[PDB]
Amino acid sequence: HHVGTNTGGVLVITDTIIVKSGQTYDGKGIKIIAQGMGDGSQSQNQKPIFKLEKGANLKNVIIGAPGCDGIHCYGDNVVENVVWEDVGEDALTVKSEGVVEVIGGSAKEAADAVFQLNAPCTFKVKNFTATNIGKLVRQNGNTTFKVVIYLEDVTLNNVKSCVAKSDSPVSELWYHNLNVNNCKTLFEFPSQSQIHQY
Numbered sequence: 001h002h003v004g005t006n007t008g009g010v011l012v013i014t015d016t017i018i019v020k021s022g023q024t025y026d027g028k029g030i031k032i033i034a035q036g037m038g039d040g041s042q043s044q045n046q047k048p049i050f051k052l053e054k055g056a057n058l059k060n061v062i063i064g065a066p067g068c069d070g071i072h073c074y075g076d077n078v079v080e081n082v083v084w085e086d087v088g089e090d091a092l093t094v095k096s097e098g099v100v101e102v103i104g105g106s107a108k109e110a111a112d113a114v115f116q117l118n119a120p121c122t123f124k125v126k127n128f129t130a131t132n133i134g135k136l137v138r139q140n141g142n143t144t145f146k147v148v149i150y151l152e153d154v155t156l157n158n159v160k161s162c163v164a165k166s167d168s169p170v171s172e173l174w175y176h177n178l179n180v181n182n183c184k185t186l187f188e189f190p191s192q193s194q195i196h197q198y
């Protein structure tokens, strides 16, 4: 394990970091604290820490409290080895269509959702831990577009509401090596047959 060369540094930011199409922001283990961008509460008006335009990637950053509005993904994004020490309003939001993969890393202390899906997408969570959360994945309430969610090698502890929630009959969730402790209910979808193993 080579921890990154920015390990031990803290970057204090005052505006959202924009990562452009085709670019990869590699924090090399930096911890980010955001100023003036939100308090990590359930207020709906906070700014994202990162905006990942379509085709942008992000890796190897710790996001400290306050989590603000987390990471906004505009599709075709890889988010790798990102640690949310204290999720804000939500951890990551899919804002526009495409494939979005969260690989490695962890999240803790999400009062509500970790991952928020606001557009049709393929959303994969791989090699990920989360503790003390409301929901791991929420498709935006009362929407009926299609998402396909994959949970692969995911460990969850202390899930207050459910692992995943959708109000869309056409959406699907597929899981493989999902371990869950102390969770109220696993899946809140119109029908349980929308959930599959692989």
Ligand SMILES: O=C(O)[C@H]1O[C@H](O[C@@H]2[C@H](O)[C@@H](O)[C@@H](O[C@@H]3[C@H](O)[C@H](O)[C@@H](O)O[C@@H]3C(=O)O)O[C@@H]2C(=O)O)[C@H](O)[C@@H](O)[C@H]1O
Residues within 6 Å of the ligand: 089, 090, 093, 112, 116, 118, 138, 139, 140, 141, 142, 165
């Ligand atoms: O992207 C966002 O931050 C969205 O936040 C709000 O929507 C979420 C969610 O999609 C809604 O269904 C609703 O969720 C319920 C409740 O308000 C709360 O989230 C919790 O008790 O869970 C409920 C549920 O999941 O059914 O509100 C959510 C919220 O974060 O408050 C916005 O209303 C959206 O327009 C997005 O901005």
Ligand SMILES: [Ca+2]
Residues within 6 Å of the ligand: 044, 089, 090
């Ligand atoms: Ca919200």
Ligand SMILES: [Ca+2]
Residues within 6 Å of the ligand: 069, 089, 090, 093, 116
């Ligand atoms: Ca949000």
Ligand SMILES: [Ca+2]
Residues within 6 Å of the ligand: 040, 086, 087, 088, 108, 109, 110, 111
């Ligand atoms: Ca929190």
Ligand SMILES: [Ca+2]
Residues within 6 Å of the ligand: 042, 089, 090, 112, 113
């Ligand atoms: Ca919320």
